[PDB]
Amino acid sequence: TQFDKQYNSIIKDIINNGISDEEFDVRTKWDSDGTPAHTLSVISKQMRFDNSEVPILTTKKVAWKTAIKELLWIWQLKSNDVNDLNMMGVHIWDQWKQEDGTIGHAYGFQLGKKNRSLNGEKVDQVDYLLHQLKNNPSSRRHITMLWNPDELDAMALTPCVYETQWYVKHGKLHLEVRARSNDMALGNPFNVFQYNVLQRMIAQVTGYELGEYIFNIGDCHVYTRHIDNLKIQMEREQFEAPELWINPEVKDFYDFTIDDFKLINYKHGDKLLFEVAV
Amino acid sequence: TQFDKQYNSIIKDIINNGISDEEFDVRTKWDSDGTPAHTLSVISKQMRFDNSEVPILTTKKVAWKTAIKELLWIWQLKSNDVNDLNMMGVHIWDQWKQEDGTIGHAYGFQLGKKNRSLNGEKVDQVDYLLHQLKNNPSSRRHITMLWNPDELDAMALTPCVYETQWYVKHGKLHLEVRARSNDMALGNPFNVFQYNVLQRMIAQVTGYELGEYIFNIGDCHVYTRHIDNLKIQMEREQFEAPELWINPEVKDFYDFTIDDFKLINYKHGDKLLFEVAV
């Protein structure tokens, strides 16, 4: 499982049977000129790895160090306050800072709400899951929801990767991920790697061997101007999947820290610039 | 797109590469003896039709006439009360009838919740969709969600087909539905057809040509006792797709009646008996 070949296959598939939206306005516009930027979309795309290798490109450098720090901000710490991420030295989310520096009732908030019952105990979403995975590995009800229909209005923004369903089958743990939308150029490579690590963290606290990693995209897209540098990317030579060292000593999920994560031998291609749009 | 051609494939696969769950217990047990009745699953299975034909079985009789009535009760009526579904001539849900007669804060109740805002107004999941469809076909947030995390503990039961994502591209309404887990034998045929009817309904009241139809399932299971008759279903002869008639006079989504539908020429195979397990 290279992730490059798969990543490539979809990009190349959009450039050939893609669908634009020139015949539509609204939203996006560049920062370079500040006016309309359209896409090329496709529906229902699936990426499934078997955890042979580790989901990461070699044709470009991925901010893996930061991915994990973001992942932890949401899942482990369960925070809606960016001031907490600032302490981790990450300023990517600074743009959505609200009056109180939060993103409202989103992400870390939705993963922290104590709305479920577990033996006469108000528990949050993640906590619940953890327990069910060990005490009831047969359930077809292992799912996490970030798209709370009752709180879409009180959110600074709607999440892309809003859900996941876990599947315990034969001492194995399988994870399926669905994002309503996903910028193939920027966010996807990030998000793929980002969640795999999560699968790995859970599988260590519950002791189930690594299963299948299924990642699905709803509105798979590419910003028009991005195409040219993407074409270059699909011409760059690939590399071997770097071994990814995680601290073996950890027994509890809430005892993890960034220093407990390492990527051994991350050889990659030079660099490529992609204009940001909003 | 016979739906048979694909269905049989999913079945033929669950037989040869299908994971068992004997090792596990809890839940599912027959009635014939009332004890341990487990499955054989496969993960991340997806089906898709170009809508050339209508998705429906020919090797067995699907009680289509009742699929719609159920659908209707939830989307058009948006009710959690079974008595309403009773008056329609259905008693297939009387089992979960709670103390009050409503299956709780599940299904229809969710769709009905006035949680979203639009033009200084409080709207439910359903209406909002209908608005943004014509008032914003480009959006990447067209999502219906029954799986509300805040109310899982308040539902008489959890939905199999819980979410939908509509995509609008080039005057074509596109529908993708997600099923957490499904029983290929009894329940699958029912749910697939049921939602292709839902598409056509919405596709008309807005005014968009019929798009692609995607349907995927997480826990794609089959019961061990059923294997027997299924090995015969696949041997049965297949028929031609019956033309579904919808009243053209309808323009509003709430102006439908069961009589507004009629399945022209539905030739099919004989009968297969599948025992119920809960």
DSSP readout, chain A?
--SHHHHHHHHHHHHHH-B--TT--SS--BSSS-S---EEEEEEEEEEE-SSS-S--SSS---HHHHHHHHHHHHTS---BTHHHHHTT--GGGGG--TTSB-BS-GGGTTT---EESSS-EE-HHHHHHHHHHH-TT-S--EEE---TTSSTTBSS--SEEEEEEEE-SSEEEEEEEEEEEETTTHHHHHHHHHHHHHHHHHHHHTPEEEEEEEEEEEEEEEGGGHHHHHHHTTSPP-PPPEEEE-TT--SGGG--GGGEEEE------------B-
Q: At what angle do helices B125-135 and B188-206 cross, to 10 degrees?
A: 50
Q: Could you give phi then psi for residue A80, rounded to 5 degrees?
A: -110, -10
> At residue A39, what is the residue type?
T
Alpha carbon distance A277, B5 (integer Å): 44
Q: Which helix (H) or strand (E) holds B182?
A: strand B172-183
Nearest Cα to Cα of residue B110 among B74, B75, B81, B146: B146
Instruction: Please name the method used to determine this structure.
Output: X-ray
CA separation, residue B165 to residues A10, A61, B72, B133 (Å) = 20, 32, 19, 12
Q: Which amino acid is at B63?
A: A
Q: CA-CA distances (angstroms) from residue B175 to A23, A162, A232, B89, B165? A: 21, 18, 34, 29, 6
How many Å apart are CA B90 and CA B109, to the nearest integer? 19
Please enumerate in sequence order all residues whose Cβ is within 8 A of that of B176, keeping only pairs 6 or more positions apart, or say none.
A43, A44, A218, B164, B165, B166, B167, B214, B215, B216
| Cβ neighbours, 10 Å, residue A37 | 20
Taking alpha carbons only, the member of A251, A259, A276 closest to residue A88 is: A259
Pairing of strands B209-223, B172-183: parallel
**Angle, helix B64-75 to helix B188-206, in steps of 10 degrees:** 60
Partners of residue B277 on adjacent β-strands: B30
**Token output for A150:** 């009752």
Alpha-carbon span A49 to A6, nearest angstrom: 10
Interchain pair A145, B147: CB under 8 A = yes
Sequence-distant (6+) residues with CB within 8 A of A81 are: A100, A101, A102, A108
Using a CB-CB distance cutoff of 8 angstroms, which residues of chain A are in contact with residue B219? 140, 167
* Cβ burial A239-266 (10 Å sphere, 16+ → b, else e): bebbebeeeeeeeebeebeeeebebeee
CA distances in angstroms from A76 to A197, A199, A201, B211, listed in the order given:
13, 13, 11, 41
Domain-wise residue ranges, chain A: 1-278
Breaks (C-N over 2.5 A) in chain A follow: none
Annotated binding site of A: 140-141, 180-183, 191, 221-223, 277
Structure tokens at B134: 């014509």
**At a CB cut-off of 8 Å and minimum separation 6, what does A210 contact?**
A51, A172, A173, A199, A200, A203
User: What distance in Å separates the CA atoms of residue A256 and residue A89, rounded to the nearest whole number?
Assistant: 17
Task: For residue B271, give the 3-state DSSP assignment.
Answer: coil
Residues in chain B: 278
Assign B221 to helix, strand or coil: strand
B214 → chain A, closest CA residue: A44
The whole-angstrom separation of Cα A24 and Cα A245 is 47
Catalytic residues of A: 160
Q: How many Å apart are CA A249 and CA A255, to the nearest integer?
A: 10
Q: What DSSP assignment string belongs to B254-265? A: T---GGGEEEE-
Return the CATH architecture of domain B1-278: 2-Layer Sandwich (3.30)
Task: Mutation target for B interface from A21, A38, A42, A44: give the one with most B CBs within 10 A.
Answer: A44
Does A150 lie at the interface with B, CB-CB under 8 angstroms?
A: yes
Q: How many other CB atoms are found less than 10 A from the CB of residue B97?
A: 16
Kindly determine whether residue B147 and residue A150, on different chains, have CB atoms separated by under 8 Å.
no
Say if the Cβ atoms of A169 and B212 lie within 8 Å: no
Check CB contact under 8 Å for A147 and B145: yes
> In DSSP terms, which residues pair with A39 in a beta bridge?
A223
How many Cα neighbours within 13 Å face the side chain of B264?
6
Q: Locate tokens 């299963």: which residue?
A: A211
Residue B220 is a catalytic residue = no
List the single residue in B with minimal CA-CA distance to A118: B153
The dihedral over CA atoms of A38, A14, B144, B182, expressed in degrees to the nearest 10, equals 180
3 state SS for A13-35: HHHHHCECCCCCCCCCCECCCCC
Give me the helices (H) in chain B, please.
4-16, 64-75, 82-86, 108-112, 125-135, 188-206, 227-233
